[PDB]
Amino acid sequence: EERLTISKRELARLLKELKKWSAPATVLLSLYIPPGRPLSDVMTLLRQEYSITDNIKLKRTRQAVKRALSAAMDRLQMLTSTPPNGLVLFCGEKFECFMFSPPEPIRVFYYRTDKRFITDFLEDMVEDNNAIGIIIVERDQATIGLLKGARLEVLKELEGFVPYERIIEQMVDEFFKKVGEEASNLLVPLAEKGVLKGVIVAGPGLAKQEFVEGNYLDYRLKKILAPELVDVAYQGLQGLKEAVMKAEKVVEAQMYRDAVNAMEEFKLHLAKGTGMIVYGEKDVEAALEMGAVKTLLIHESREDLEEWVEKAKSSGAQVIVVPESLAEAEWFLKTFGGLAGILRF
């Protein structure tokens, strides 16, 4: 029935709580059913899986799976045919059987028992297609990173040995192929899912130009290379940040630059005893009340996060959510309880 369908807005809410689920043994059921797939087929498959469970030497575990399997069968015998976007079920133990139709049509049947729910397919359509890949390249060292909204992370770091120029050239060549392969394995699936919109290549000196001109980078990634190479001095998280801040022509990076610029502006006011900031709940409240706040900075680990968002909607304040991964995030949370405002007066 079409009544089972939920939006991307509800899917994500649910996702935050599905992601919470865990178990010692592989006893949490995940089940995705495409529209093309008759429920009688699924029913036979679950029934087979049910007989197979006797193979589980281990009382509690064996029981656990049977119970979840039965719950899913119960659920399916409530329906006549799969909804138009398919069905997904998660069941297990505190026992529950989540069942719904996703905003997006699923196409690949999937069944699994694990120590957690498999949310894979669902996160991909709850997910803004706004990811940027970043490759920092040096002759003998590299960093591969990923930016989504304000979240920046290191995916992989690599090193090579590189002490006439012939042997050394060949050595650098080998390292660039390793970097190229590593980057491609990490980024190409993202690009294929449509999630990856671009790739920044950065680094000190000439190596990044050499890297880009050669065959190292898969053509799917080459296609969406940001036009301009970015000069950056460092590797690791630090170099990734620098490349993102300096890639001013990439639009998908603005949300991150906004968060960083806001944090720096906030700190500059602090450092210069300017009085152009507010902190402490009572103060932030009163500042908001008279429309005195231009930007509200809120650490994402605050439980009252959304309340301050509402309050900032009206009060006419821009909200910057500070991710836990932001460099100053922990300092911000420790010294200001993860709540502060920059004032317009």
Which CATH number belongs to the domain containing residue 246 in this structure?
3.30.420.60
| Last residue within a domain, chosen from 89, 104, 128 | 128
Q: Do 102 and 34 have their domain in common? A: yes
d(CA 171, CA 156): 20
CA trace torsion 7, 8, 9, 14 (10° rounding): 90
Q: Cα separation of 272 and 88, whole Å?
A: 55
Chain breaks in the chain (C to N over 2.5 A) after: 93, 163
Partnered with residue 99 across adjacent β-strands are 89
Alpha helices (runs of H) in 159-227, residue ranges in sequence order = 165-192, 207-213, 219-222
- Shared domain check, 146 and 82: no
**Token pair recorded at residue 171:** 């050595």
Asked if residues 101 and 94 have their Cβ atoms less than 8 Å apart, the reply is: no
Helix (H, G, I), strand (E, B) or coil at 4: helix
Domain of 345? 253-345
* Same domain as 135, residue 221: yes
H-helix or E-strand spanning residue 263:
helix 254-271
- Return the axis-axis angle of helices 59-76 and 39-52, rounded to nearest 10°: 170
Structure tokens at 276: 């152009």
CA atoms within 13 A on the CB side of 101: 16
| CA separation for the pair 138, 78 (Å, rounded) | 59
Q: Please spell the DSSP secondary structure of 33-84, one letter per residue.
A: E-TTS-HHHHHHHHHHHHHHGGG--SHHHHHHHHHHHHHHHHHHTT-SS--T
Give me the torsion for CA of 89, 118, 106, 121, rounded to 10°: 150
Question: What resolution does the deposited structure have, in angstroms?
Answer: 2.1
Same domain, 141 and 244: yes
Listed residue (255, 261, 257, 225) closest to 244, CA to CA: 257
Order of strands across the sheet that contains 196-203: 151-159, 141-148, 131-138, 196-203, 230-231
Give, as one character, the DSSP assignment of residue 251. Answer: G
263 and 238, same structural domain?
Answer: no
Say yes or no: 20 and 116 in one domain.
yes
Number of structural domains the chain divides into: 3
Percent of the chain as helix, strand, coil, to the nearest 5 = 45, 25, 35
Q: Indicate the pairing of strand 141-148 with strand 96-100.
A: unpaired
Q: Are residues 270 and 345 both part of a single domain? A: yes
CA distance 308 to 305: 6
Residue 236 and residue 262 in one domain: no
Provide CB contacts within 8 A for 45, sequence distance 6+: 111
**Which tokens go with 232?**
């950056």
Q: Under a CB-based contact definition with an 8 Å cutoff, are residues 184 and 267 in contact?
A: no
> Cα dist. 118→19, 77, 113, 254 in Å?
9, 23, 9, 31
- Beta-bridge mates of residue 203: 231
For the chain, give the number of residues. Answer: 345
Can you tell me whether residue 333 is helix, strand or coil? Answer: helix
Q: Among 252, 276, 295, identify where a domain stops.
A: 252
CB 93 within 8 A of CB 64: yes
Deposited experimental method: X-ray
- Could you tell me if 217 and 300 lie in one domain? no
CATH number at residue 262: 3.30.1330.30
- Order of strands, edge to edge, in the sheet holding 318-322? 277-279, 339-343, 293-299, 318-322
Instruction: Please tell me whether residues 64 and 168 are part of one structural domain.
Output: no
Sign for the pseudo-dihedral over CA of 304, 310, 315, 316: positive
Closest Cα to residue 247, out of 202, 277, 289, 303? 202
Cβ-based neighbour number of residue 130 at 10 Å: 16
> Sign of dihedral through CA atoms 31, 35, 37, 42?
positive
Among residues 218, 252, 286, which one ends one of the domains? Answer: 252
Residues in a beta bridge with 98? 90
174 lies in the same domain as 112:
no
Token pair belonging to 121? 């397919």
Same domain? 162 vs 232:
yes
